[PDB]
Design a binder for this molecule. Structure first.
Ligand SMILES: Nc1nc2c(ncn2[C@@H]2O[C@H](COP(=O)(O)OP(=O)(O)O)[C@@H](O)[C@H]2O)c(=O)[nH]1
Ligand SMILES: Nc1nc2c(ncn2[C@@H]2O[C@H](COP(=O)(O)OP(=O)(O)O)[C@@H](O)[C@H]2O)c(=O)[nH]1
Lengths: 311, 314
């Protein structure tokens, strides 16, 4: 409590109020903050939402720290969030940045739950006046698609070498990308290496059909460590925002995303009621085991689960 | 209902009439009929799974019906029994001429359900019945408009994408989401002469891009091939590549592993379809569900508030 004061404080720009709200996001504490979000929904959405991914070691934290510091220096308020699978189990300079709000990936039993708390945290930050939301993720199962469905622009960071030199990435990320940035383009030979690799990705991306006629994903080279190409990278993100806002496509994407998250939440309530209940959790596991083990057909397993939903 | 023990025998004996009967019973409006079929399937489960399951997709007009008709006919001539199953999202609302007359083929349209998940899950059950009846090749095709590509990929062992022969400025391009699903790209309409030169030119562009974009050392590297479904070119080679995939991924256990993941997916799909039935069961709940979706879609209420409203209705 009390939720009327918290809201007025949040909308004013109060960091402790944002912190408090985020903390709430206990079942009755969860629910209180959801009514708050519905109430400030009209003051959300005035932010550029960017998803960022890439292989461990590519330079995500380094690049985020460098870009976020450029952005705060230019007068933005930057929220840096995360969707990390490891949360179900240091960007040093941005931390000291009072105009940045870093939040580690929230704890939750499922990746759906991690995704759900992050989307909540994002709307809270927007209501609090943050105008850039960066969402960091790693390529684990479904997290990349989840983050691409949470943001306006999905940035994929790549090591400076394609084809035979690729490792540790899921193929589909090239289709989620609104831009590929090849990192480690350090003065000298790094520039040549990264540029060679960018030219290959550029040639390859030509076979993938862009989802919008309004935007053809660029391939750029950057050095997050040495601060090369970062302003040009951001300029492309701003270009995308401008062009797709003009056609109504940012709004359009956001609406689709919202209805997707609505249905995903319904299925999430359902599942964790079946998995939480000391009454039916074992029966649910037994049905999944019978199906996965080929003892009973998928439909037979669904039949057993139906009875548990009865009760 | 008929005697289900006789029906089971006839099905396992490979009787095509029994298969169609079991399918008709699955499509019945009576729940008690649909239940009998579910029990039959559980009973014949140990006799299922000895088939190559292939998903096939491509844009309308690429020549999918023609290619399936041709390939299906080669396979039945080679001693196989072939089922062709469609998956179409318009099954949730509201022509292969030679194979249609082939006694060793079994063709069925997309089953009705409330959700695409439901349609696909009912397709998996149909696939099990076909396999129990001795069908050793199951072709599952996407039909109409819709994004049923993922559903068809998650129903099968191998996902084949058919593409148009355009090259250079006329290259078709791979649609978003298909690149990560494709186990092979076949450029169709490689007719003798100009057509096959365009198809080979397109294949070379796809092959070069795929090399750049595909991390090495996967068990299987998706090939790019050219075919003509209409003139019967490249189909035996295309099939040998699918048999190669089966061998390689059977040896690593990857085919069994994927089928396990899929089966659990389809179980949960059926659970969700049943809860969707609840939300569209009467005019009043249908309208309430629509109003929740419209509120979230219009920015008036948050996703969580819409989800609250839905959960309540059930
Ligand atoms: N040479 C070079 N090294 C970099 C660059 N960006 C990051 N690194 C280094 O790459 C390693 C991984 O960086 P980090 O940001 O932690 O990677 P992350 O796991 O993707 O978040 C560290 O040693 C970084 O200092 C760059 O642009 N050039
Ligand atoms: N020239 C040529 N035409 C083809 C080939 N395969 C299919 N077609 C034609 O392309 C049109 C669409 O074929 P269809 O099989 O119905 O395509 P679908 O909509 O993808 O199922 C028809 O006129 C076919 O005759 C081919 O290999 N060569």
């Amino acid at each position: 409590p009390d939720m009327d004061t918290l809201r007025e404080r949040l909308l004013a720009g109060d960091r402790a109020a944002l912190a408090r709200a985020i903390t709430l996001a206990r079942a009755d504490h969860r629910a209180a903050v959801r009514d708050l979000i519905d109430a400030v929904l009209p003051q959300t959405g005035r932010a550029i939402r960017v998803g960022i991914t890439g292989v461990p070691g590519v330079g995500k934290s380094t690049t985020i720290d460098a870009l976020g510091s450029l952005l705060t220096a230019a007068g933005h308020k930057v929220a840096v969030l995360a969707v990390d699978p490891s949360s179900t189990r240091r960007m040093a300079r941005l931390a000291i940045d009072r105009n940045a709000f870093i939040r580690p990936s929230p704890s939750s039993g499922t990746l759906g739950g991690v995704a759900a708390k992050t989307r909540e945290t994002m709307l809270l930050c927007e209501a609090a006046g943050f105008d850039v939301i960066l969402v960091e993720t790693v390529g684990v199962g479904q997290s990349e698609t989840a983050v691409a469905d949470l943001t306006d622009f999905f940035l994929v960071l790549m090591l400076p070498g394609a084809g035979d030199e690729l490792q540790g990435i899921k193929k589909g990320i090239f289709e989620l990308a609104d831009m590929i940035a090849v990192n480690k383009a350090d003065d000298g030979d790094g520039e040549r290496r990264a540029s060679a690799a960018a030219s290959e990705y550029r040639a390859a991306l030509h076979i993938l059909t862009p989802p919008s006629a309004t935007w053809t994903p660029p391939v750029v080279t950057i050095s997050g460590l040495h601060g090369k190409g970062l302003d040009s990278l951001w300029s492309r993100i701003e270009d995308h925002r401008s062009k797709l806002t003009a056609t109504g496509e940012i709004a359009g994407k956001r609406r689709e995303q919202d209805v997707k998250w609505m249905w995903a939440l319904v299925h999430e309530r359902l599942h964790q009621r079946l998995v939480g209940s000391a009454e039916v959790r074992q029966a649910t596991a037994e049905a999944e085991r019978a199906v996965a083990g080929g003892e009973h057909s998928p439909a037979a397993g669904a039949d057993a689960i139906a009875t548990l939903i009865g009760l």
